[model samples]
Structure formats: structure tokens, C-alpha cells
Target: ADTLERVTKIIVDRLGVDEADVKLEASFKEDLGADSLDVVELVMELEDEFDMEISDEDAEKIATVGDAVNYIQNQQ
Candidate 1:
């Protein structure tokens, strides 16, 4: 769906990683090499694009690309 594509682009652009690397199973820290700041920034970028606010607790639990996708999708 468009959510996955948009999320993929966001992660690819924010993390400077290849598009293929932004897979659903990919973990932001273990796979994407995202530190705390990068994760937080990603959440903010998602909020901007998705037009929703993610609580700190919710953001912390979103460890993988799939986790993020599921969260955003379910929220919608």
C-alpha cells in the first residue's frame, strides 16, 4: 500500500540507506544503524507526513520498520 511505500521512502531518505534495505523485518537500530536521535527524528518525520502524534512510549516500542508500519496502519 501507499503507507509502506511512503514509510519506506522516509526511512531511506532519513537514514541514507538503500531502498531495498528498508524492509519490514529490518530493525531500526540493529539493521538500519539508527541511534536514539535518528529514531526520534524518524518519529517526528513520520508525524509530519502521517499527520498524527506518536507518544514517547509508542515511539520507543516501534523498533522495526514493520512495527512502524503496523502502528501507523492500525492507527488509521
Candidate 2:
């Protein structure tokens, strides 16, 4: 759905990663050039984008692009 498109676009825009790099299997840290700070800020951006607060435990479990996409798809 559009959620994948929207989330990927958000990640590309906010993280400055190219669209070519946003594979669903990509690891946020190991693959996408994100550090712990990047992950935290990424969550904040996602929270803002979806207008939903994510719990720390749930946030911690999201380690890949697909995880994030699934989270938003179910969240809405």
C-alpha cells in the first residue's frame, strides 16, 4: 500500500539515503548508515509522520525497513 511508499520516502528524505538503498531487508544500522542516534531520530520522525507514539520496547524491535513498514501498516 501507500504506507510502504510513504515510509520509505520519509526515511529517504529525513535520513538522506537514496531511494535505491531502501530495500525492505536493509538493516538500519549495518546497511543504511544509521547509528543509535539515527535510529532514535528516525523513530521520532516516524512518530511524527504517523501521529502515533511508539513504545520504547516496540521501537527497539524495529531493526529493518520491513519492520518499520509493518509497524505502520498495522498501526493505522
Candidate 3:
């Protein structure tokens, strides 16, 4: 889906990491080295990518690569 690709690209670009580095099992903090601010920014990027607003509570739930994919899929 376009949402998936866009979300993935946002994570990749914002994290300053390779696309390959973002796996389903990758954790936003421990695995990917994303801090709280990074996660917030990533959520913002995703929200912008989808042209929708995500609440802070919902954004906090996006902890892994698959979580982002699943969230975008459900939103679609």
C-alpha cells in the first residue's frame, strides 16, 4: 500500500537509518535507537504522509515497524 511505503520511508529517513534496518521486529527505541522525540517526530511524519492527524496516545502505541504498517493499513 502507498501508506505502508510512505510510513516506512518516513521511519527510514527520519531515523537516519537504512530502509533495510527497519524490520517488523525492530523496536523504535531499543532496536532502531529512536528516542522519545524521534518517535514523536516519526509519528508526525506519518501523520503528514497520510494527511491525517494521530493523537499522542495512538502515536505512543506505534512501537515497531509492523505496528506502523498495521496502523496505516487499518486507517486505509
Candidate 4:
């Protein structure tokens, strides 16, 4: 779950974005064109799957693909 494959797969499945679009700098909002609600749900899914609770503050801070993956790794 800490690997890029896991994060990318989750993001792709949830956001309906292609794997090519899920780059390190791709922001969930701007790059992926996900709205606030979309990101909130995505964050929830990440929390549930990762078994890590991401506070709203922390979730907002995670703007990019790498940020999400890095956050998960750091928590582990």
C-alpha cells in the first residue's frame, strides 16, 4: 500500500483518471479535476484502505499525488 502502484491504482479507480495522469505533481484538484467533495471521498477511501485517519487539515495539505503517497509512507 505504500508503493506507487497501490496509490496510483486507488486514485485511478476512484477518480476515473488514467494512470498516466497520476504523476507525482498531479494535484487531485487541479490536475485531476476533482472537486472538494471528490477529494473528501477519495481521502476517506484512502483512510479506510490504509487504516490511517487523515484529519481534514492533513487531507487539505495533500495536494499532489506524491504528497498522498508520502503521507501514507510517513504514517507507516
Candidate 5:
């Protein structure tokens, strides 16, 4: 759970927004102002943080904060 929190915090920080703005339902692009490259870098950061490899296809599927948390949890 803390890992999830940390991951969410990182996303919020990288997106340059308040932590409150990041939620399970928030879309990285539409809601959090994260463009494609931002999302890509975010996924890369997540992969490195978790010591796992997230492919481009999987990265594209991650739209919300919950999606990222769940993906990391599942992979781990």
C-alpha cells in the first residue's frame, strides 16, 4: 500500500499537480495534464521503481492511477 502511495505521489509530482488531483479515476492525460511522453516516462519510472519491465503496449493500457497501482501490484 505504501508502494502504491509512493507511486501515486511520484506521478502527482511529475505531473506538476496537487496530490489531491491524483485519484483512481483521474486520467493521466485528460485529467492530470500528462501528455503521451509524460505517460511514457512515468511508466518507465514505475518500471524502474518496481524493478520490472513494462512494455509499451502495457504502458498504453494504463490510463488511471488505479490502473498503475494494480499493474504494479499484479506484476510484483
Candidate 6:
């Protein structure tokens, strides 16, 4: 889905990580060096990107770039 690109950009932009580092299969903690606190901010960023709610339960599931790519596509 085109959301793949959008979600990828979201992570890269918010995390200030290189686009090269943000891979579809990369898990945040293991691959991106994301601290536990990083995720909360990330979720809030995505929520604000929407003028709508992104379920907290759903947002928490995005422990990986792969997860975010899939989960966010459905957020639409």
C-alpha cells in the first residue's frame, strides 16, 4: 500500500533517523536503537498527524517498523 511510504517517512522524520536506517523489517528496540520512551512520542506524533484518534492499544502494537507500516495503513 502507498501508506508504506508514508509510514516510513513518519518514522524517519520523527526519529530523526536516516531513511537508510528505517527498514520495513527493522524492530525499533533491536534495530533502530529506540529507547522505551521514544515510542510514546512516536505514537503521539502519529495521532496528531491525524485529526483523529489512533487507538492506544493499537499504537502500542507498533514495536517494529513492519508493525507500524501495517497498522498505520489500516488507520485510514
Instruction: Name the top TM-score candidate.
Output: 5
Instruction: Name every residue pair that clashes in candidate 6.
Output: none
lDDT tens readout by residue for model 6, 1-76: 5565555567777653765555546555666677545654565566566443555554556655456556566666
Best first by lDDT, ranked: 5, 3, 1, 4, 2, 6
Report the poorest 10 consecutive residues by lDDT, candidate 3: 15-24
Model 1, runs deviating above 4 Å? none
Candidate 4, poorest ten consecutive residues by summed lDDT = 15-24
lDDT tens digits by residue: candidate 1, 1-76 = 8776777678777764655445456556666676756665676687677776766555566665567767778877
lDDT of 5 at 68: 70
| Residue 48 local lDDT, model 2 | 73
Give candidate 1's whole-model lDDT. 0.66
The C-alpha stretches of model 6 lying farther than 4 A from their native spots are 55-57
lDDT of 4 by residue, 7-50 (tens): 66776776646545444576667776777566656766776677
| Candidate 3 local distance difference test against the native | 0.68
- Ten consecutive residues with minimal summed lDDT in candidate 6? 50-59
Tally clashing residue pairs in candidate 2.
0
Q: Per-residue lDDT for 1-76 in model 2, tens only?
A: 7776777677777554665545556666666666656654665677677775655545466765567768887877
Model 3, stretches more than 4 Å misplaced? 63-65
- Candidate 1 C-alpha error for residue 20, in Å: 3.6
Q: Tell me the TM-score of model 2.
A: 0.69
Models 1 onward score TM values of 0.72, 0.69, 0.73, 0.70, 0.74, 0.60
Q: What number of backbone clashes does candidate 5 have, counting pairs of residues 3 or more apart or in separate chains?
A: 0
Give lDDT per model, in order: 0.66, 0.65, 0.68, 0.66, 0.69, 0.58
Backbone clash count, each prediction separately: 0, 0, 0, 0, 0, 0
Estimate, for each residue in 1-76, the C-alpha lDDT of model 5 and write its tens digit. Answer: 8668778777767764665655567666776667867765776787788876776655677665567768888876
Model 5 alpha-carbon miss at residue 20, Å: 3.2
Candidate 4 local lDDT, residue 68: 69
